[PDB]
Amino acid sequence: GSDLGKKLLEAARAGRDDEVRILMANGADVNAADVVGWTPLHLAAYWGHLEIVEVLLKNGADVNAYDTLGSTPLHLAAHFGHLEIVEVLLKNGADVNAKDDNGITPLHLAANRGHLEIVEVLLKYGADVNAQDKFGKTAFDISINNGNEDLAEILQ
Amino acid sequence: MPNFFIDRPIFAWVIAIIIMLAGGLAILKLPVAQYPTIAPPAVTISASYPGADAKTVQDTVTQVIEQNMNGIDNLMYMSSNSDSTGTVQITLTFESGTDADIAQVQVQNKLQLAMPLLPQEVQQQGVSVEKSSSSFLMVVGVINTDGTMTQEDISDYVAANMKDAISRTSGVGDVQLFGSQYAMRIWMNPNELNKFQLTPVDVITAIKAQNAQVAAGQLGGTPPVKGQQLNASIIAQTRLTSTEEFGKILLKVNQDGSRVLLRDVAKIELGGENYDIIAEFNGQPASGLGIKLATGANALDTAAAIRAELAKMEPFFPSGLKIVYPYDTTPFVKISIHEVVKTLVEAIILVFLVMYLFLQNFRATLIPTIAVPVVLLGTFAVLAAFGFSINTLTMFGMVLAIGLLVDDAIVVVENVERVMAEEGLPPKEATRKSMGQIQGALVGIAMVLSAVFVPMAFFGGSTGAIYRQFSITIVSAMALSVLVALILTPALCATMLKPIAKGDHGEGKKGFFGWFNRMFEKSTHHYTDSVGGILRSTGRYLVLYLIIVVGMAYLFVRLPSSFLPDEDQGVFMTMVQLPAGATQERTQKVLNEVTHYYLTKEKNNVESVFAVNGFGFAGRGQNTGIAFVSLKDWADRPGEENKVEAITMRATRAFSQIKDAMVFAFNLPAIVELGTATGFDFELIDQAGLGHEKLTQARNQLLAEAAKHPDMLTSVRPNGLEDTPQFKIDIDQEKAQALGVSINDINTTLGAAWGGSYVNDFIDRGRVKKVYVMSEAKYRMLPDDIGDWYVRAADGQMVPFSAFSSSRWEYGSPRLERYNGLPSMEILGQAAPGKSTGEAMELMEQLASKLPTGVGYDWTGMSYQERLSGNQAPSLYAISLIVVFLCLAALYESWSIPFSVMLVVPLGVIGALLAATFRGLTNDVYFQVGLLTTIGLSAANAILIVEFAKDLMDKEGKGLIEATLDAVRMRLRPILMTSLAFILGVMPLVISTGAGSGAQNAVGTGVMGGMVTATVLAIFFVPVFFVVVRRRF
Amino acid sequence: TDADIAQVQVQNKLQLAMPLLPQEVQQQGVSVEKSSSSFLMVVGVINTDGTMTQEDISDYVAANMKDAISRTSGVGDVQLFGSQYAMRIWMNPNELNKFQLTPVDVITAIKAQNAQVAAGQLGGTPPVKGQQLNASIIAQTRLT
Amino acid sequence: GIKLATGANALDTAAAIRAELAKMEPFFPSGLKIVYPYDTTPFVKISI
Amino acid sequence: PGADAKTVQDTVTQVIEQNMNGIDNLMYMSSNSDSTGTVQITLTFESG
Amino acid sequence: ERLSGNQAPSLYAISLIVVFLCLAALYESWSIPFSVMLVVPLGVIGAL
Ligand SMILES: CCCCCCCCCCCCO[C@@H]1O[C@H](CO)[C@@H](O[C@H]2O[C@H](CO)[C@@H](O)[C@H](O)[C@H]2O)[C@H](O)[C@H]1O
Ligand SMILES: CN(C)c1ccc(O)c2c1C[C@H]1C[C@H]3[C@H](N(C)C)C(O)=C(C(N)=O)C(=O)[C@@]3(O)C(O)=C1C2=O
Secondary structure, three states, X not given: OOHHHHHXXXXXXXXXXXXXXXXXXXXXXXXOOOOOOOOHHHHHHHOOOHHHHHHHHHOOOOOOOOOOOOOOHHHHHHHOOOHHHHHHHHHOOOOOOOOOOOOOOHHHHHHHOOOHHHHHHHHHOOXXXXXXXXXXXXXXXXXXXXXXXXXXXXXX | OHHHHHOOHHHHHHHHHHHHHHHHHHHHHOOEOOOOOOOOOEEEEEEEOOOOOHHHHHHHHHHHHHHOOOOOOOEEEEEEEEEOOOEEEEEEEEXXXXXXXXXXXXXXXXXXXXXXXXXXHHHHHOEEEEEOOOOOOEEEEEEEOOOOOOHHHHHHHHHHHOXXXXXXXXXXXXXXXXXXXXXXXXXEOHHHHHHOOOOHHHHHHHXXXXXXXXXXXXXXXXXXXXXXXXXXXXXXXXXXOOHHHHHOOEEEEOOOOOEEEHHXXXXXXXXXXXXXXXXXXXXXXXXXXXXXXXXXXXXXHHHHHHHHHHHHHHHHOOOOEEEEEEEEOHHHHHHHHHHHHHHHHHHHHHHHHHHHHHHOOHHHHHHHHHHHHHHHHHHHHHHHHHOOOEOHHHHHHHHHOHHHHHHHHHHHHHHHHHHHHHHOOOHHHHHHHHHHHHHHHHHHHHHHHHHHHHHHHHOOHHHHHHHHHHHHHHHHHHHHHHHHHHHHHHHHHHHHOOOOOOOOOOOOOOHHHHHHHHHHHHHHHHHHHHXXXXXXXXXXXXXXXXXXXXXXXXXXXXXXXXXXXOOOOOEEEEEEEOOOOOOHHHHHHHHHHHHHHHHHHOOOOEEEEEEEEOOOOOOOXXXXXXXXXXXXXXXXOOOHXXXXXXXXXXXXXHHOOOOOOEEEEEOOOOOEOEOOOOOEEEEEEEOOOXXXXXXXXXXXXXXXXXXXXXXXXXXXXXOOOOOEEEEEEEEOHHHHHHHOOOHHHHHHHHHHHHXXXXXXXXXXXXXXXXXXXXXXXXXXXXXXXXXXXXXXXXXXXXXXXXHOEEEEEEEEOOEEEEEOOEEEEEEEEEEOOOOOHHHHHHHHHHHHOOOOOOEEEEEOHHHHHHHOOOOOHHHHHHHHHHHHHHHHHHHHOOOOOHHHHHOOHHHHHHXXXXXXXXXXXXXXXXXXXXXXXXXXXXXXXXXXXXXXXXHHHHHOOOOHHHHHHHHHHHHHHHHHHHHHHHHHHOHHXXXXXXXXXXXXXXXXXXXXXHHHHHHHHHHHHHHHHHHHHHHHO | OOHHHHHHHHHHHHHHHHXXXXXHHHHOOOOOXXXXXXXXXXXXEEXXXXXXXXXXXXXXXXXXXXXXXXXXXXXXXXXXXXXXXXXXXXXXXXXXXXXXXXXXXXXXXXXXXXXXXXXXXXXXXXXOOOOXXXXXXEOOOOOO | OXXXXXXOOHHHHHHHHHHHHHHHHHXXXXXXXXXXXXXXXXXXXXXX | OOOOHHHHHHHHHHHHHOOOOOOOOEEEXXXXXXXXXXXXXXXXXXXX | OHHHHHHHHHXXXXXXXXXXXXXXXXXXXXXXXXXXXXXXXXXXXXXX
């Protein structure tokens, strides 16, 4: 960890675009991670800060960085319904099929929260409709258990 | 009345003796404390939910309690925190004047009825309902110096062998243990458990069965068969008493017949109930007692009684155990009493000297020396009767009143002496004539002072409670003062003064007094010449007066306001705040630095550092701590450089370097409620369904906007905690059902191991104590540890936690706040320099009006007590103004002549402001009360000038100017005498350094500035006021 | 009679009976009040756009207005003319029998799966030496 | 339906109730409105 | 119920008594703990 | 009983002092008062 890295984790989390700008100009480590393995990109993904997501990617952020439980920024953005950030991440080479330690994918997460547009994007980018988590569940299993009919229909 | 007692000096003495006995008695029995109760009554509800996260606490405890806080009288507002240490505190604040006992029983009773809705483990811990207090009498530290005891060892020793005796000590109202009594600690090993197909559930079950009190009955109990010879109680199973016995608890018998005991799956030891606080006193393990003074108790007696009890425990201490006193307000309070007694005594001595300098005979000298103590004693008796205590405020109240008391004594005696020298009348006849001249004015003065100070007793809230202490003290003193002036001092004059030959002004005397008299007689003529010239040219003086009034307003508007002066109380505080998520060990490192600094760099100033790791003020947790610093006695800290303010400043600069931590030192506030600062206290509120995240966004929005007005708002900040990473674990219901693993087994296995669980009680050397099970540390540190915990399925197979769970990182709140039952976030800030808190509050409301739909706000605390009892000041001094005018009108039998007295007000205020401004002080409580007494005394001087003038015109047919010059000639000496004695007397206060000098300066500076300009200006301006007012009508 | 003391004396005796009462009675909350028997006023609430039913308004009132009114000094008792919302589970005996289940299973499942668990902390005190992580463990939370 | 606590002042309590309702109104859902169907308070104030 | 005198004293009487501090006007306190498990604690206050 | 006995001397002393002062005040004398107070043992001995 570094001084400016800490400041960047905080600014990305807070969505302070201008500070991120300045920090990017000064070489603040885009690959800094806190104790649970979240990078500034994780943070911006989680809290829905799109412009910072884009800035961070222009500045060499690891789009497929994973935390200590194997989750990527795409997991976060997909889970919390940030559609534009999901799109940007995918445009920049996010692994649409990344499995966290639980065998959970971005598609599983988006299904579970019923984010329909995000599910369509992930499918559009090759999300594996048949991927099973550690319990043998698919996005489709999740949709019928949740009783989400629109979602179930999308997943055939 | 004066006539009555001039003929009845013995009756007058009897009244005086009665007053003295009452006051003497009052002095013996009066309670003593640093401060009286000031803050509105509050009741706190505290609950503990072992291993609970903030949201769990809030949603299974806090909301439920809050929803039952109905039908309670005189509630102002209610607030709460729920946090991830598993703690909730709900605070209910009541209207000033509410009976705190009733408030508290109504709260406790509504709680009792909500208990059945709380979780079992919360009912088990209990929920405490208490009266709130932030002030301690003292903190007794208890340390072990030979490395043989842990803080847990010490806390239990204190709990078992010291606390109860201190609680039973005379005058103590409450004692808090800084730690806990022992708990029986069962630290489980998941590998051992799984080895024998056991879980924490089996451990809890076995403990509940083998550590229990079992009822049996009696042999030969009633109804018996007749002829029974024996009746005896049956004793069956009773609780375990020792770690050995807990160790031998039987968990399982294997097929080979071998036995699994609790000690085979766990480490067993006496330990603490909690491990969140690590306390050290100069690096050594520490516990302690926080002691509060009981209602009506005498602080000094109690502190003394506490020390005597401790001393008689000392012989039985184990080796290395030592008592330490890091905080004790008593020595400071002793100083204040000695200083106030010193001030009053030398005031009396100064009056003595001034009386002899001018009057030059010891008999006149003795009269004030008797009258003033009689007034003081009687005032104590009245205060006592009112239920007041001897405290900082009431003591300084009497100091602020000294000028007023002395003036009544000097005025009565000086006038008799003048009349004797000017007329040759014998002492008795002179005294009658003299009281005939000042009688009505003395009463008028008492009424006017009453009209000035009494309205000040009617301010609301906390600042009102403070003002009331000065108001009632000073008004009582004035009441006694005029009674003694109409009763005792005339009697004393008529019977103790020697005659003076007509025309004898002592100018024939030899030596110094001979030279003083001719000097002062000439000065009087010079003085009256000037007044004569001034009165030939009053136009320019009206201009000068307006210039003073304008300047008074100018200085008044720029003088920053405050509440009470900081003091060097021999102690101060250091805040240690690490980033969110920082562990206890990291926080300890920084406290170690802080401590090493003070014991090195401040070696000559610091006695001790009491380091409390894990404790904060606005949120506990592993990442926060405090270092409480105790200094050597003021006597070993000569100079401003070795006083608290300087030590603190150096500390904070030194710690500004410290790496990843905010570390700063600060002095303690005089009270602590009252919030000092400029300070406003704002609550942002979720009024709709919004939720924590949307409330946070709205808060951030507000804070960003506030920051754009540095001109108006400064340091606008949240008072709470930011969200932090938390570990979310999902139990898969289906997989658990498929494996035959019950959810209950899963959840208690998790909670017991990782959170700890209060099982039941045991008896440790005759004292009942708790039994806790929890994982040994190394098995509950990290996510990978989760999978080492196994649960037994119905079919007997051991199933690892990883088989039926999944986990992810997320963010959540470590501390959830609510206000009046709704989600909330407290924001602190202050008005920017030059700006009024009222202005700052208005902006905050404006910014608050533009926040997202559903977001509301409120004012609480010090700000709640501005939105009301501040819109109240102007109408009180309007009432004061009107009543003062009405008294003067009655005194002078004129609607217009009163103005010539009231015009004096700015003359003293200008000097007070000039002096406070110059010395860099503030417009605080002592300043303000001082303004009132300075105004009061100058008004009394003016009243007697106008009175003399007006009577010369009415009774001797003299002209306006002729009467004014004669009036002002007669009043010059008594006016100078009082001012001289007073100004000299309040001078030590102005220059004072060291303990209590903050208060002493605030009292002295304003009074001395004001009395100088009031005296010097009014002896020239009052003649002008009277002449111009009389001409105009 | 001092109504404060009367209420205190009544409740002191009530808490002696409380433990002898059925658990379902204690959980509904028994209350002790000191008020007049007649209504001071009735505060009515309506929706002039007709966008809320009787049930909706009643829940709105119970959930956003009634508690603060109930805490207001001088308010002795407050009656809601309606009912706060609850999670209503309307059981079907035919389907219960079809799956060989009863209301007892339904009740047990609800207690098991609508639970708010205390689960402790990673890196919680007392910790091992050199611990770097401290975080709350969040398990089951109440359904919503 | 609000009942007055034993001994409490009816007019003061009604005032405090209105003050409290005033704090709530700005956050009502659209269409929600308070009406005043039954009040024993006005008559006291008016008859006096 | 069922507790002996010493057990009820250690688990009940002493627990209550050590919380009976800082009560106004308390003159003295007496208690007894007995073999039927019953505890009685009497607190006597100054005459006024 | 202990309290009763302990405060009695104080009671007598303050009572005698008050009686003396009232006399002094009423008869504008210290001598008249001292003259009558000397009577007190004359009555007390009979009571005893
Ligand atoms: C105890 C405090 C003692 C402090 C003493 C320090 C000195 C204070 C001086 C007070 C001011 C008195 O100043 C007084 O002014 C008036 C004018 O206004 C002068 O009066 C003179 O000038 C005026 C105006 O030209 C003429 O009308 C007047 O006939 C003439 O005698 C007085 O001669 C002077 O004595
Ligand atoms: C905050 N304070 C003055 C101190 C100072 C030094 C200390 O050494 C301690 C405290 C707080 C007290 C509170 C007590 C409390 N109780 C009176 C037993 C308590 O409920 C808790 C708790 N975490 O639940 C403690 O931390 C606690 O056990 C504790 O360990 C403390 C402690 O060790």
